[PDB]
Amino acid sequence: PITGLVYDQRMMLHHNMWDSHHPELPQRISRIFSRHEELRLLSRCHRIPARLATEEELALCHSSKHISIIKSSEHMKPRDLNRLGDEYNSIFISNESYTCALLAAGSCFNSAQAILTGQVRNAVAIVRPPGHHAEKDTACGFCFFNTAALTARYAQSITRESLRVLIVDWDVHHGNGTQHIFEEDDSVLYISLHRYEDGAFFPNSEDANYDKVGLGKGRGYNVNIPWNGGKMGDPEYMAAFHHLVMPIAREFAPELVLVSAGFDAARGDPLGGFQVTPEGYAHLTHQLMSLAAGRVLIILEGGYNLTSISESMSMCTSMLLGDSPPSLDHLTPLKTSATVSINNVLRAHAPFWSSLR
Numbered sequence: 401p402i403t404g405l406v407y408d409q410r411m412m413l414h415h416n417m418w419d420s421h422h423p424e425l426p427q428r429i430s431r432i433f434s435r436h437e438e439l440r441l442l443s444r445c446h447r448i449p450a451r452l453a454t455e456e457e458l459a460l461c462h463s464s465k466h467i468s469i470i471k472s473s474e475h476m477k478p479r480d481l482n483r484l485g486d487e488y489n490s491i492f493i494s495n496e497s498y499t500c501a502l503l504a505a506g507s508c509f510n511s512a513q514a515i516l517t518g519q520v521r522n523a524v525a526i527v528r529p530p531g532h533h534a535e536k537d538t539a540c541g542f543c544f545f546n547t548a549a550l551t552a553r554y555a556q557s558i559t560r561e562s563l564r565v566l567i568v569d570w571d572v573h574h575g576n577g578t579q580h581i582f583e584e585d586d587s588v589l590y591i592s593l594h595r596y597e598d599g600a601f602f603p604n605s606e607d608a609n610y611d612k613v614g615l616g617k618g619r620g621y622n623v624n625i626p627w628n629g630g631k632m633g634d635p636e637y638m639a640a641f642h643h644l645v646m647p648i649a650r651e652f653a654p655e656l657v658l659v660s661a662g663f664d665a666a667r668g669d670p671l672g673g674f675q676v677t678p679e680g681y682a683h684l685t686h687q688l689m690s691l692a693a694g695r696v697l698i699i700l701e702g703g704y705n706l707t708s709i710s711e712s713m714s715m716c717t718s719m720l721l722g723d724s725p726p727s728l729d730h731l732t733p734l735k736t737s738a739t740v741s742i743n744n745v746l747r748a749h750a751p752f753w754s755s756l757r
């Protein structure tokens with residue numbers, strides 16, 4: 401079995417003109433790539449080439465108006481870029497942002513194509529800017545286009561429309577864009593774990609609560625696991641996977657698994673406030689590898705401690721390569737609210753998933 405890896409240093413060109421120390425740093429991706437080299441993981445992977453997504457591919461999930469305005473920022477003056485970024489929630493734009501977002505999406509398309517054509521068993525995508533906050537019609541939360549959602553639709557376009565895609569979003573923030581894009585869809589199962597705090601945590605919407613189970617044909621196909629009042633870590637994430645993520649995913653029987661793999665729930669992240677360990681992410685990855693005949697694509701989302709995201713993502717790649725999972729630390733008893741959260745989700749989704757009854 402072969403593991404693919406995509407990375408292109410061009411994606412570092414997206415930058416914040418006013419605040420060069422903004423945490424969504426160019427060196428997020430080069431630091432992760434460097435750690436793969438340092439651990440001698442890179443030579444064990446097959447390098448998958450980056451490419452630019454096309455405008456037609458962006459239209460799989462995004463409106464013509466949104467594509468057009470982000471496209472136009474490549475030739476904007478600094479004042480145009482500042483004003484346009486400030487129309488969105490938490491966005492900065494440079495003349496390179498559009499091209500970098502194209503590269504992130506196209507890198508994942510090539511990785512999904514390599515998996516689906518049997519060239520690699522699984523793959524990891526070291527990409528920026530991130531994607532999961534991006535909506536059909538708007539940018540949000542450092543994201544311009546929804547890379548993971550586009551990759552799911554791209555996968556469907558080269559296989560069949562009803563190809564069952566599971567998106568597991570373990571970034572510490574809710575993937576509002578991914579939820580909304582697939583909310584009426586039963587071919588793409590969205591599962592998000594996220595710090596919620598009764599709606600107070602970014603992106604600050606009650607859409608992220610456990611009772612949002614999907615709409616219409618998609619009822620039952622949106623699973624929110626929201627955390628409140630606790631510094632969650634490996635025990636709570638392992639419990640959520642045991643009781644919720646893996647039973648539902650097994651019943652759904654995905655043909656492709658995409659991981660919206662933010663590493664901002666990691667110990668040491670300056671924003672997330674959680675303490676998931678690199679070994680914890682390794683165990684989450686190893687569990688997902690038991691789905692979809694191993695067809696797993698890990699897509700970088702958030703995560704802002706450069707050392708933390710480098711250790712965490714490289715251990716996920718180690719798991720994809722077949723290495724034995726490392727031992728976890730001593731697990732503390734589940735924080736009270738985390739049991740409450742899991743039980744709340746169980747009650748919400750027992751109507752739709754017989755494995756939860």
Ligand SMILES: O=C(NO)c1ccccc1
Pocket residue numbers: 490530533541542571572573602662664671701702703
């Ligand atoms: O990491 C984030 N989303 O994944 C994020 C963090 C702070 C503000 C906006 C977005």
Ligand SMILES: [K+]
Pocket residue numbers: 569570571572573574575592593594
């Ligand atoms: K999430």
Ligand SMILES: [K+]
Pocket residue numbers: 582583584585586588589590614618621622
């Ligand atoms: K869905």
Ligand SMILES: [Zn+2]
Pocket residue numbers: 571572573662664701702703
């Ligand atoms: Zn995040």
